[PDB]
């Protein structure tokens, strides 16, 4: 949240419009209350960058190469998989219970049905996504290392 300002003399219109560039911001209610377009006017802020600035900003988040190929302790990986599958078991029980509903439910009541109560379908989808990502990544990294390192 940033803005640039300049004042208006005691005069007419403060500025001349030779394009649409000025009228693209929809000045905020707070600024209008506190004196925008009456005691001062705004100026558009632009963030022109040079090539080196762009490259450095992009490179900021780049990680070391070894981190990419590094594997992950197999004991911890198996423990995490086991924990998530055990959770998915109870989530499947609850999902079976929930599917039996949704027919004995008012069209409006369904929306407020999931307020303060767990959503087995959503949690199952999230767990499936996390498990798939982790296992696929680990298997692919293992194979890649198997070939690269002799």
């Amino acid at each position: 949240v940033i803005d640039a300002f300049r004042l208006i003399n005691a005069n007419h219109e403060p500025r001349q419009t030779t394009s649409n560039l000025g009228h693209l911001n929809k000045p905020s209610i707070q600024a209008l209350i506190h004196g925008l377009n009456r005691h001062y006017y705004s100026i558009t802020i632009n963030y022109r960058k040079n090539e080196l600035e762009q490259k450095m900003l992009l490179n900021l988040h780049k990680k070391s190469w070894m981190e990419g190929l590094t594997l992950q302790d197999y004991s911890e990986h198996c423990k995490h998989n086991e924990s998530v599958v055990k959770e998915m078991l109870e989530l499947a029980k609850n999902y079976n219970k929930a599917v039996e509903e949704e027919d004995k439910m008012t069209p409006e009541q369904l929306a407020i049905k999931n307020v303060g109560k767990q959503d087995p379908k959503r949690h199952l989808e999230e767990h499936v996504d996390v498990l798939m990502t982790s296992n696929i990544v680990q298997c692919l990294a293992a194979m890649l290392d198997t070939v690269v390192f002799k």
Binding site: M132, I136, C139, L140, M143, L144, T146, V147
Partner: peptide, 15 residues
């Protein structure tokens, strides 16, 4: 010999 290229291809297809 741990067929590795084919397994990598299979997992990449999964992804």
């Amino acid at each position: 010999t741990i067929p590795s290229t084919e397994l990598a291809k299979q997992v990449i297809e999964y992804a």
